[PDB]
Ligand binder design. Structure first.
Ligand SMILES: [Mg+2]
Ligand SMILES: [Mg+2]
Ligand SMILES: [Mg+2]
Ligand SMILES: [Mg+2]
Ligand SMILES: [Mg+2]
Ligand SMILES: [Mg+2]
Ligand SMILES: [Mg+2]
Ligand SMILES: [Mg+2]
Ligand SMILES: [Mg+2]
Ligand SMILES: [Mg+2]
Ligand SMILES: [Mg+2]
Ligand SMILES: [Mg+2]
Ligand SMILES: [Mg+2]
Ligand SMILES: [Mg+2]
Ligand SMILES: [Mg+2]
Ligand SMILES: [Mg+2]
Ligand SMILES: [Mg+2]
Ligand SMILES: [Mg+2]
Ligand SMILES: [Mg+2]
Ligand SMILES: [Mg+2]
Ligand SMILES: [Mg+2]
Ligand SMILES: [Mg+2]
Ligand SMILES: [Mg+2]
Ligand SMILES: [Mg+2]
Ligand SMILES: [Mg+2]
Ligand SMILES: [Mg+2]
Ligand SMILES: [Mg+2]
Ligand SMILES: [Mg+2]
Ligand SMILES: [Mg+2]
Ligand SMILES: [Mg+2]
Ligand SMILES: [Mg+2]
Ligand SMILES: [Mg+2]
Ligand SMILES: [Mg+2]
Ligand SMILES: [Mg+2]
Ligand SMILES: [Mg+2]
Ligand SMILES: [Mg+2]
Ligand SMILES: [Mg+2]
Ligand SMILES: [Mg+2]
Ligand SMILES: [Mg+2]
Ligand SMILES: [Mg+2]
Ligand SMILES: [Mg+2]
Ligand SMILES: [Mg+2]
Ligand SMILES: [Mg+2]
Lengths: 271, 46
RNA sequence: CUUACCACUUUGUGAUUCAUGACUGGGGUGAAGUCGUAACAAGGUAACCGUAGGGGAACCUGCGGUUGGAUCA
RNA sequence: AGGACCGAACCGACUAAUGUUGAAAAAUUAGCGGAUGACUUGUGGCUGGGGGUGAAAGGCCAAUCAAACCGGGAGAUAGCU
RNA sequence: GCUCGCCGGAAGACCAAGGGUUCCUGUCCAACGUUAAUCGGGGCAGGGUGAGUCGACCCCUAAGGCGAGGCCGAAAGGCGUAGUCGAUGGGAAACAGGUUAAUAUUCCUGUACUUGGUGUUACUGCGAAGGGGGGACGGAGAAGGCUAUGUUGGCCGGGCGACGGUUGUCCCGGUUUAAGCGUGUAGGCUGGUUUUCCAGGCAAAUCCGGAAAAUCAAGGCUGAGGCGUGAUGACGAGGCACUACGGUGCUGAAGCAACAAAUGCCCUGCUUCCAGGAAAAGCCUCUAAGCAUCAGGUAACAUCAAAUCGUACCCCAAACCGACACAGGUGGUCAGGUAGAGAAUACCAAGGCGCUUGAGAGAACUCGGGUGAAGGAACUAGGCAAAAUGGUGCCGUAACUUCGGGAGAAGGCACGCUGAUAUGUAGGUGAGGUCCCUCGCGGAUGGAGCUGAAAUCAGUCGAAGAUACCAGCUGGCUGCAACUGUUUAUUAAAAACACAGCACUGUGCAAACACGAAAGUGGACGUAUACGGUGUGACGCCUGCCCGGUGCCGGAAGGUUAAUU
RNA sequence: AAUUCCUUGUCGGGUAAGUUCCGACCUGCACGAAUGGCGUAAUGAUGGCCAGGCUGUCUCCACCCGAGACUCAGUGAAAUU
RNA sequence: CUUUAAUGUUUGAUGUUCUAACGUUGACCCGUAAUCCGGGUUGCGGACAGUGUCUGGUGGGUAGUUUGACUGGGGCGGUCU
């Protein structure tokens, strides 16, 4: 559940956290972790590329495994592990083969439950399956860009993609972005809506959260000297200028999108 | 209050030490420039 | 001599009432002055109730409900 | 439990006085703010100049900053003194 | 040398960093000490730091750096694969006394320990840069147990007291003692084990992961301290012989017990929480190629080896950063007594000091403070500054409110000491003796002795008992910014920035964008419940009208329009 | 009004007397709805106004204890010119 | 032979499918006890994408400069033949 929080501090008043009591409380499956390293937003030259970044907590990378193959081998959901890396809720798997991996854990995060992933398998939330096989109008899940790429769609919480047309060797689905996208069809993509979803109900409350979350503060334009930002303004607020990123570019229009080596796939533009 | 000079042998060296001022082009060009000018101690003797 | 209780009386802070006030909410009276004419007949767009928004003003429009609606609808 | 409360160390600088050829090229004394946190600190690393960094003041980048310092162009140019 | 004052969570002690002979002794006093100076961190000589166990090397890696070939770039060079360096973090081992003018977990004495080679003995599958396990990790909080160590009695040694009293029923001092070795306990974790099978751990594996049956439950790991040994040793107040007068030999009493504690240890624990909390090697185990009475591996023991540098001294300062023998800056460790909540504070211990110009006088005036009749903010830009307020428990406490607050609101009462309750209570602590037992670091019952609040009565001295230091002034209205936070180092801390929330907008992944001629990279080992940009700045109630101009989104038919032909 | 020039606007409040302050009016020189409008509990070394207590802030300074200043011995500056 | 038509034909237009340059930051192999790189296989994409030269647009993101004088101070105003 979410539950607010008794206003005990001049900041602990809006702290409306979220919790999943069924979430295992204990160190993760060690043999599936590996450092993480804090980038701080710097580049190779040691120069900051993207602003807002730093501090945060230690954080240790899990492993997940969006690839998901082991077709023809079942596995019961050992536990449900909270993931620091992403927003979703990773879940230990463990196949009857003895080997145990990780998964994003979909809506039906029913613990203990069993799931396969074979090429044949059976249309069920939590089963690796190439859309070329799975039905249509399905909720799918971790969609896979290319045939064996490794799935890179709806990898966040609440996410989900609904199939529409399997015309020829290319299937057309609908990303949560409301955009019509085409895929090689012969691509796997687990199943079921991604778990959690109630994530988009946070709130934090006090800067502390966002701060120890890795997100550094942000400075507005028409608040700093000209030499620093195009919105120099200064002297009694002011503006008049055109809302543009710190590099003269109307931060309103301009799609900026100029891939072209993809249009073919993209059918009905995001809206 | 606090002064602008907090010593540290290690730093003082790797920051302006021989090898260092010998691991780069200009840096290496520096030493030469020095030896040329005829300097007693080349770089932070030790 | 001293102690206990204790009246007068003192201080601080809450509750209640009466009175009162720049200014302002509408309410009631007479001239019945100005702006319209909402409702009463089908009142000239049937009306009223609740409710929401809007507007010089009655009041208008949306939503459901009532018949305490005239014509044979 | 809490960027919760009072208050040392610790970190910070609101007020006044004294110093203003100081004890000091920013401090001393008396008060003063935070003090489990966006805290504080040792150690070592990475960002280099029209570049970095900036909870943004044009602030900081070795007592220097509306473009550091060192050397060179260079005896710049100076209808001005 | 005797007095006096100062510091004592330091102004004591030890280590880092930095310093580099400043260390000790001897000498000399020109220059150097803000003066003298017989003195010194000054001069000049010598002397002076001994390690298998402390540290660095070394092993192992973090951030990050370097980088064969390599991928890019006019050149120089950029980047980065294998790998290789790189701590601030992980790997094995020594304590206790004694000694020097100056050394010390180094030298000496006593008592131990780590690991490698070689040998003897018993036993046995050994073998990796390869698999597994382990190393190996967060925040806060809540105990209990224990040690530190303190106080008090016992004990031993000394002392009967410059002035009234002091044989005990009193005063003073001491009461220490380790590693390692055995026991493995308060507690903490966890059920073991044999066999069989296998799409896993890149190959293999007996190991780890999975699935099966049976069998016993009283299995195994971890663990502070305590207890013996260490140690009839040492040390130890105290003495007598010599002295250099600072010191030197010899000798050497007791040496227990009770209670009270930790911010230390058990505790890399335990409880819980969301912000989900290094890697690598050592280590143990599992097999590969291979070896195949061999080689190796395990344990006991004998022995050899443990190299080389660093060890002086200052270290919160007169040796370090500040030009100075400068009121500033400087990380970590230790943690005494009374009072106290306490690392504040006050007075003292050990210990260290009196800050390197002195002697007088006792003007105005400046500086720092103490006290003031009557008045009480008339001061003044403004109560600036001063003065005041302050502690504990109990009584009691407003509008307003987001119901948490406001709130220590306000305003009040009591506080010392002495007798009693109660010969020291409540409580804490826990010795006999008895029972039973696996059978003692057992359990039970027993409550001696030790320590020990507050309260309530009655009495009592002073002007006053939270007597010192220390330690809130309070309330009312109103602007501004929700709030904690940040900021102009060195005139501005604010109403400025930042924020939690909000809305617009871009981004379909080789994302947008940013660094970069490039390669490459941050974005993210993320993927539209995500990320970027811009404006607003909790929350409540709201956020109306204008698209003419500018910009931006969409369209493309037509008009105009480049290179080119 | 952090926006009001004419401005000490006008009226009410507090005062012995109030160009500030509080509550109003509207005639807004020249507010106005995310370069947000209006309120808001709690919060603040934030701006303004008021009261009690408190007092050398003052009326109106006096006394007092110390550090200098003064006298002696020693060493011994500076700016300026 | 001029005006207008069918199959040939060459050339500019759009528009299809193919692969064989080219791309692939899909998968696998080998160099190899390497997520760099190179060669190979396969899949996907495909003369598109990107790049080079030329070229229209946009372009305070950046850069070099200009932005007069007489003035009863300068500015404003006015003036400049
Ligand atoms: Mg500014
Ligand atoms: Mg600009
Ligand atoms: Mg400015
Ligand atoms: Mg300004
Ligand atoms: Mg009508
Ligand atoms: Mg009608
Ligand atoms: Mg109706
Ligand atoms: Mg706090
Ligand atoms: Mg505090
Ligand atoms: Mg102070
Ligand atoms: Mg500076
Ligand atoms: Mg020249
Ligand atoms: Mg010149
Ligand atoms: Mg010397
Ligand atoms: Mg000496
Ligand atoms: Mg000397
Ligand atoms: Mg190494
Ligand atoms: Mg490199
Ligand atoms: Mg180290
Ligand atoms: Mg006597
Ligand atoms: Mg030493
Ligand atoms: Mg010594
Ligand atoms: Mg001195
Ligand atoms: Mg002195
Ligand atoms: Mg007086
Ligand atoms: Mg006055
Ligand atoms: Mg006056
Ligand atoms: Mg004051
Ligand atoms: Mg005071
Ligand atoms: Mg005001
Ligand atoms: Mg604020
Ligand atoms: Mg300042
Ligand atoms: Mg200031
Ligand atoms: Mg703002
Ligand atoms: Mg605002
Ligand atoms: Mg609007
Ligand atoms: Mg007003
Ligand atoms: Mg405005
Ligand atoms: Mg603050
Ligand atoms: Mg003299
Ligand atoms: Mg320019
Ligand atoms: Mg020029
Ligand atoms: Mg002129």
């Amino acid at each position: 559940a979410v539950v607010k929080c008794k206003p005990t501090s001049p900041g602990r008043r809006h702290v409306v956290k979220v919790v999943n009591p069924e979430l295992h409380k204990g160190k993760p499956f060690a043999p599936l972790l590996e450092k993480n390293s804090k980038s701080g937003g710097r580049n190779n030259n040691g120069r900051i590329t993207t602003r807002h970044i730093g501090g945060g907590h230690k954080q240790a990378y899990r492993i997940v495994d969006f690839k998901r193959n082991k077709d023809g081998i079942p596995a019961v959901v050992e536990r449900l592990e909270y993931d620091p890396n992403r927003s979703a809720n990773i879940a230990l798997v463990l196949y009857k083969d003895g080997e145990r991996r990780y998964i994003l854990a979909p809506k039906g995060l029913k613990a203990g439950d069993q799931i396969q992933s074979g090429v044949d398998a059976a249309i069920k939330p939590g089963n690796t399956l190439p859309m070329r096989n799975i039905p249509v109008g399905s909720t799918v899940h971790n969609v896979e860009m290319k045939p064996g790429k490794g799935g890179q769609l709806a990898r966040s919480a609440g996410t989900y993609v609904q199939i529409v047309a399997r015309d020829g060797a290319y299937v057309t689905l609908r990303l949560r972005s409301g955009e019509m996208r085409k895929v090689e069809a012969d691509c796997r993509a687990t199943l079921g809506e991604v778990g959690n979803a109630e994530h988009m109900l946070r709130v934090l409350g006090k800067a502390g959260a966002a701060r120890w979350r890795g997100v550094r503060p942000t400075v507005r334009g028409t608040a700093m000297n000209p030499v620093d930002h195009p919105h120099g303004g200064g002297e009694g607020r002011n503006f008049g200028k055109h809302p543009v990123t710190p590099w003269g570019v109307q931060t309103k229009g301009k799609k900026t999108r100029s891939n072209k080596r993809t249009d073919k796939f993209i059918v009905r533009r995001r809206s | 209050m606090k002064r602008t000079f907090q010593p540290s042998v290690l730093k003082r060296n790797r920051s302006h030490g021989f090898r260092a001022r010998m691991a780069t082009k200009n840096g290496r060009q520096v030493l030469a420039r020095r030896r040329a000018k005829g300097r007693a101690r080349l770089t932070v003797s030790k």
